[PDB]
Design a protein around this ligand. Structure first.
Ligand SMILES: Nc1nc(Cl)nc2c1ncn2[C@@H]1O[C@H](COP(=O)(O)OP(=O)(O)O)[C@@H](O)[C@H]1O
Ligand SMILES: [Mg+2]
Ligand SMILES: [Mg+2]
Length: 319
């Protein structure tokens, strides 16, 4: 049985999604798995998207202030994890920030102060009965509050894809959802090697990190922004100010066995800045982190620093 390499990519969930697979299984089996990957992404766009009017999330937001809404167990589990990170991050990750995000999607100061009164994630009530077949429900108790899962959905979907690939007996893959990476297993050279994941120059890869069975997710200011009167406004909001976060790092990359967790923590850490991020990350010892600073210094945690290679010599890896 010969090793074959396959890839497939499509525009879906608002970005370019690519999956690369190495396998000795029959090609028809790999093709079927990749078909199901991209069917899954299409279906989940219709569940999770905060920027379509016809998604399940949009339907849920339309019921803010009203009765509990039945959701499927997958969406419930994502919300559960999002609220966990909201609590652990001290609200710097906030999945109930849609009222503010939608205004930035420069907004007026009062209009903005008003939106900030409708972002209390502690008013998202998840309830699920314990008896057989009991429904999962979500209630948004604060009128006008709006969920936005943009800071965790790609991580969640990368995890779901890894689960699907493994269900199809695939153990070597590179999942790339708009730069939200999961490195499954080892790649092939007959040698088996770690996947080499590049991290971009925030102002541009600058660095490459060798990983196995690991998600690599980066949050940064220069991923998405607009400019007005000489000021840049990026897409990661500080929930305290309602404005794009002022932070001492240009990007944070999180390395975690679950992409859901890497994505949420990457956003939280960006808002928190370097010193508070290191404190938070002590609570997640199975996670590693790499920080790129505006002066092009790079700091990486002990679990990954020996796997980091600088490709752009303007950057310096502190050891
Ligand atoms: N403090 C915050 N907490 C949370 Cl919970 N969500 C936030 C947030 N500020 C913005 N958002 C939303 O989340 C996306 C960024 O999510 P990201 O993973 O950091 O960046 P990428 O898009 O490159 O993956 C943005 O567009 C917004 O929709
Ligand atoms: Mg995120
Ligand atoms: Mg993300």
């Amino acid at each position: 049985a010969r090793v074959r390499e396959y890839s497939r990519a499509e525009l879906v969930i608002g970005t370019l999604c690519r999956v690369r697979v190495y396998s000795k299984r029959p090609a028809a089996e790999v093709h079927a798995a990749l078909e199901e990957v991209f069917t899954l992404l299409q279906q989940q766009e219709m569940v999770l998207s905060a920027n379509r009017d016809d998604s399940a999330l949009a339907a849920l937001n339309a019921q803010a202030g009203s009765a509990p809404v039945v959701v499927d167990r997958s969406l419930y589990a994502l919300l559960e994890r999002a609220l966990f990170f909201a609590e652990k991050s001290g609200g710097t990750f906030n999945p109930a920030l849609g009222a503010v995000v939608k205004l930035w999607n420069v907004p007026d100061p009062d209009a903005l102060k008003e939106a900030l009164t409708r972002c209390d994630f502690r008013q998202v009530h998840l309830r699920a009965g314990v008896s057989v077949g009991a429904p999962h429900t979500v209630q948004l108790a604060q009128a006008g509050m709006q969920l936005d899962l943009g800071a965790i959905a790609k991580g969640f979907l990368a995890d779901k894809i890894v689960q699907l690939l493994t269900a199809h007996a695939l153990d070597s893959a590179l999942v790339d959802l708009g730069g939200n990476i999961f490195a499954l297993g080892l790649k092939y050279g007959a040698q088996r090697l770690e996947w080499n994941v590049g991290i971009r120059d925030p102002h541009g890869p600058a660095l490459v990190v060798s990983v196995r069975d690991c998600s690599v997710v980066t949050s940064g200011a220069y991923e998405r922004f607009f400019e007005r009167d000489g000021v840049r406004y990026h897409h990661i909001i500080d929930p305290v100010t309602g404005f794009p976060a002022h932070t001492d790092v240009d990007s944070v990359s999180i390395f975690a066995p679950r992409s859901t967790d890497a994505d949420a923590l990457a956003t939280a850490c960006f808002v928190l800045g370097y010193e508070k991020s290191c404190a938070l990350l002590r609570e997640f010892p199975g996670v590693d982190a790499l920080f790129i600073f505006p002066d092009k210094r790079v700091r990486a945690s002990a679990g990954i620093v020996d796997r980091v290679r600088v490709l752009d010599a303007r950057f310096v890896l502190e050891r």
